[PDB]
mmCIF file of C-alpha atoms in Angstrom:
data_model
loop_
_atom_site.group_PDB
_atom_site.id
_atom_site.type_symbol
_atom_site.label_atom_id
_atom_site.label_comp_id
_atom_site.label_asym_id
_atom_site.label_seq_id
_atom_site.Cartn_x
_atom_site.Cartn_y
_atom_site.Cartn_z
ATOM 1 C CA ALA A 1 33.244 39.265 19.029
ATOM 2 C CA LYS A 2 33.187 40.212 22.707
ATOM 3 C CA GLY A 3 34.953 37.125 24.063
ATOM 4 C CA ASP A 4 33.621 33.568 23.758
ATOM 5 C CA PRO A 5 35.535 30.642 22.235
ATOM 6 C CA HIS A 6 33.997 28.967 19.171
ATOM 7 C CA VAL A 7 35.438 26.020 17.245
ATOM 8 C CA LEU A 8 34.521 27.250 13.767
ATOM 9 C CA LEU A 9 33.989 24.450 11.232
ATOM 10 C CA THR A 10 33.063 24.475 7.571
ATOM 11 C CA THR A 11 31.898 21.044 6.438
ATOM 12 C CA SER A 12 30.953 20.249 2.850
ATOM 13 C CA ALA A 13 27.457 21.463 3.786
ATOM 14 C CA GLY A 14 28.562 24.877 5.007
ATOM 15 C CA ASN A 15 30.539 26.980 7.493
ATOM 16 C CA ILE A 16 29.197 26.340 11.011
ATOM 17 C CA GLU A 17 30.482 27.356 14.460
ATOM 18 C CA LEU A 18 30.770 25.413 17.730
ATOM 19 C CA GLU A 19 31.281 27.227 21.045
ATOM 20 C CA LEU A 20 33.212 25.547 23.871
ATOM 21 C CA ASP A 21 33.635 26.040 27.617
ATOM 22 C CA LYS A 22 37.134 25.941 29.050
ATOM 23 C CA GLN A 23 36.691 26.821 32.715
ATOM 24 C CA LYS A 24 34.825 23.661 33.721
ATOM 25 C CA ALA A 25 37.420 21.447 31.939
ATOM 26 C CA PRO A 26 40.859 23.067 31.554
ATOM 27 C CA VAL A 27 42.596 19.736 30.932
ATOM 28 C CA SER A 28 40.408 18.564 28.051
ATOM 29 C CA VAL A 29 40.551 21.939 26.285
ATOM 30 C CA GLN A 30 44.364 21.782 26.194
ATOM 31 C CA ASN A 31 44.225 18.325 24.608
ATOM 32 C CA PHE A 32 41.793 19.125 21.792
ATOM 33 C CA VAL A 33 43.437 22.512 21.111
ATOM 34 C CA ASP A 34 46.559 20.413 20.491
ATOM 35 C CA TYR A 35 44.627 18.695 17.707
ATOM 36 C CA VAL A 36 42.634 21.839 16.887
ATOM 37 C CA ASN A 37 45.918 23.714 16.462
ATOM 38 C CA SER A 38 46.315 21.615 13.288
ATOM 39 C CA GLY A 39 46.611 18.184 11.681
ATOM 40 C CA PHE A 40 43.291 16.406 12.211
ATOM 41 C CA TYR A 41 40.123 18.339 11.328
ATOM 42 C CA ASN A 42 41.489 19.749 8.050
ATOM 43 C CA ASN A 43 39.963 16.777 6.163
ATOM 44 C CA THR A 44 38.131 14.497 8.571
ATOM 45 C CA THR A 45 34.316 14.569 8.454
ATOM 46 C CA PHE A 46 31.240 13.894 10.583
ATOM 47 C CA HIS A 47 30.579 10.147 10.870
ATOM 48 C CA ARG A 48 26.850 10.866 10.890
ATOM 49 C CA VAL A 49 23.914 11.805 13.105
ATOM 50 C CA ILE A 50 20.739 10.569 14.699
ATOM 51 C CA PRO A 51 17.990 12.560 12.937
ATOM 52 C CA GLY A 52 16.877 15.886 14.425
ATOM 53 C CA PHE A 53 18.560 14.911 17.710
ATOM 54 C CA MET A 54 22.376 14.859 17.629
ATOM 55 C CA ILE A 55 25.215 15.102 15.107
ATOM 56 C CA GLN A 56 28.678 13.905 16.200
ATOM 57 C CA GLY A 57 31.425 14.196 15.283
ATOM 58 C CA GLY A 58 35.129 14.329 14.427
ATOM 59 C CA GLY A 59 36.709 10.868 14.192
ATOM 60 C CA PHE A 60 37.140 8.297 11.419
ATOM 61 C CA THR A 61 38.748 10.241 8.563
ATOM 62 C CA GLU A 62 36.296 10.269 5.657
ATOM 63 C CA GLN A 63 34.836 6.787 5.171
ATOM 64 C CA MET A 64 35.641 5.969 8.809
ATOM 65 C CA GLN A 65 39.037 4.569 9.801
ATOM 66 C CA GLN A 66 40.730 5.706 13.009
ATOM 67 C CA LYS A 67 43.389 8.378 12.662
ATOM 68 C CA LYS A 68 45.607 7.278 15.489
ATOM 69 C CA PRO A 69 44.017 8.531 18.747
ATOM 70 C CA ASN A 70 44.552 7.550 22.381
ATOM 71 C CA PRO A 71 46.062 10.522 24.422
ATOM 72 C CA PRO A 72 44.068 9.492 27.515
ATOM 73 C CA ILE A 73 42.954 12.515 29.556
ATOM 74 C CA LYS A 74 40.490 12.017 32.454
ATOM 75 C CA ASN A 75 37.031 12.821 33.825
ATOM 76 C CA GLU A 76 34.602 14.282 31.266
ATOM 77 C CA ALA A 77 30.815 14.347 31.628
ATOM 78 C CA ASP A 78 31.208 15.473 35.269
ATOM 79 C CA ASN A 79 31.900 18.999 33.964
ATOM 80 C CA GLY A 80 29.400 20.524 31.514
ATOM 81 C CA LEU A 81 26.512 21.996 33.590
ATOM 82 C CA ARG A 82 22.954 22.368 32.282
ATOM 83 C CA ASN A 83 21.911 23.348 28.759
ATOM 84 C CA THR A 84 20.073 22.163 25.611
ATOM 85 C CA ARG A 85 20.198 21.248 21.898
ATOM 86 C CA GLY A 86 22.976 23.613 21.018
ATOM 87 C CA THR A 87 25.739 22.166 23.250
ATOM 88 C CA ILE A 88 28.672 20.030 22.128
ATOM 89 C CA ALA A 89 30.014 17.161 24.276
ATOM 90 C CA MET A 90 32.800 14.553 24.234
ATOM 91 C CA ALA A 91 32.082 10.868 23.563
ATOM 92 C CA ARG A 92 34.071 8.442 25.783
ATOM 93 C CA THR A 93 35.474 4.896 25.649
ATOM 94 C CA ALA A 94 35.073 1.411 27.133
ATOM 95 C CA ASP A 95 37.789 1.984 29.742
ATOM 96 C CA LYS A 96 36.398 5.206 31.178
ATOM 97 C CA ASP A 97 38.998 7.926 31.684
ATOM 98 C CA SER A 98 40.009 8.643 28.083
ATOM 99 C CA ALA A 99 38.110 10.540 25.375
ATOM 100 C CA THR A 100 41.344 11.218 23.489
ATOM 101 C CA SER A 101 39.911 13.074 20.472
ATOM 102 C CA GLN A 102 36.247 12.982 19.464
ATOM 103 C CA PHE A 103 33.171 15.135 20.147
ATOM 104 C CA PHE A 104 29.569 15.419 18.891
ATOM 105 C CA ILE A 105 27.075 18.222 18.297
ATOM 106 C CA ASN A 106 23.589 17.819 19.798
ATOM 107 C CA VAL A 107 20.468 19.781 18.781
ATOM 108 C CA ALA A 108 17.427 18.546 20.768
ATOM 109 C CA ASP A 109 16.626 19.013 24.458
ATOM 110 C CA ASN A 110 18.828 16.318 26.029
ATOM 111 C CA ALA A 111 19.812 16.544 29.730
ATOM 112 C CA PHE A 112 18.943 12.836 30.034
ATOM 113 C CA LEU A 113 22.646 11.981 29.736
ATOM 114 C CA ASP A 114 23.310 14.421 32.623
ATOM 115 C CA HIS A 115 25.600 12.330 34.822
ATOM 116 C CA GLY A 116 23.310 11.681 37.797
ATOM 117 C CA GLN A 117 22.515 7.972 38.216
ATOM 118 C CA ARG A 118 23.921 4.445 37.798
ATOM 119 C CA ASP A 119 25.597 5.680 34.609
ATOM 120 C CA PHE A 120 28.266 7.950 33.113
ATOM 121 C CA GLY A 121 29.478 8.236 29.501
ATOM 122 C CA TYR A 122 28.927 11.271 27.263
ATOM 123 C CA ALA A 123 31.064 14.315 28.055
ATOM 124 C CA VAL A 124 30.259 17.968 27.237
ATOM 125 C CA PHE A 125 32.097 21.303 26.891
ATOM 126 C CA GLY A 126 30.469 23.425 24.130
ATOM 127 C CA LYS A 127 27.445 24.510 22.162
ATOM 128 C CA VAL A 128 26.422 26.043 18.810
ATOM 129 C CA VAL A 129 26.018 29.716 17.895
ATOM 130 C CA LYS A 130 25.211 30.187 14.198
ATOM 131 C CA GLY A 131 25.193 27.555 11.466
ATOM 132 C CA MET A 132 22.930 25.120 13.331
ATOM 133 C CA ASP A 133 20.881 24.935 10.118
ATOM 134 C CA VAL A 134 23.997 23.761 8.257
ATOM 135 C CA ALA A 135 24.258 20.944 10.798
ATOM 136 C CA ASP A 136 20.556 20.280 10.187
ATOM 137 C CA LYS A 137 20.800 20.236 6.394
ATOM 138 C CA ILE A 138 23.752 17.887 6.917
ATOM 139 C CA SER A 139 21.566 15.847 9.280
ATOM 140 C CA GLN A 140 18.926 15.982 6.493
ATOM 141 C CA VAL A 141 20.731 14.061 3.742
ATOM 142 C CA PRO A 142 19.809 10.367 4.008
ATOM 143 C CA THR A 143 22.207 7.646 5.180
ATOM 144 C CA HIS A 144 22.308 4.087 6.342
ATOM 145 C CA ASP A 145 23.114 1.824 9.265
ATOM 146 C CA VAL A 146 26.663 0.813 8.418
ATOM 147 C CA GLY A 147 27.281 -2.238 10.545
ATOM 148 C CA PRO A 148 29.233 -1.447 13.713
ATOM 149 C CA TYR A 149 28.552 2.311 13.798
ATOM 150 C CA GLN A 150 24.814 2.778 13.285
ATOM 151 C CA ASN A 151 24.030 6.047 11.487
ATOM 152 C CA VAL A 152 26.459 7.019 8.722
ATOM 153 C CA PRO A 153 25.835 9.257 5.709
ATOM 154 C CA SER A 154 26.041 6.825 2.797
ATOM 155 C CA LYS A 155 27.026 9.815 0.659
ATOM 156 C CA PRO A 156 29.669 10.902 3.171
ATOM 157 C CA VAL A 157 30.330 14.438 4.405
ATOM 158 C CA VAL A 158 33.845 15.938 4.217
ATOM 159 C CA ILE A 159 35.048 18.734 6.492
ATOM 160 C CA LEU A 160 36.681 21.824 5.002
ATOM 161 C CA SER A 161 38.216 23.481 8.091
ATOM 162 C CA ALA A 162 38.282 24.148 11.847
ATOM 163 C CA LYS A 163 39.466 27.543 13.123
ATOM 164 C CA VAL A 164 39.059 28.557 16.763
ATOM 165 C CA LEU A 165 38.371 32.229 17.525
ATOM 166 C CA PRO A 166 40.035 33.869 20.542
#
């Protein structure tokens, strides 16, 4: 136990466990915890995943059809320090300052995205302790390019739960 926050999630595949910062992004944490607290994850899913590289997720409920997001926070990527396939990170949005409710679980040595150039998009504020495999196995089952959103599990996943540990 010790003391290290972990957004625990049990998708159809199995019970996994994210682990999230806090310090480097107080604001964001508050937001998601709002959602986390309840009414959202209970029966969303995981859109999909680029093979052995990066699973999302949290967004389009089931098939994929916006909940009703848009509680626009602020700066993201510029607060996630170094790491590797294991970290979670927030998506973004056309505008810029937003990322209302949606994150994605990596796996492979990334860094590339590391805000440091004529660019800035993908946030960050977590990781992955245990059920990485689960994620994998999930990211194993075939899929298909949908149309708009490339990479979506034809035979869709369905999340069971999301319970944060102190």
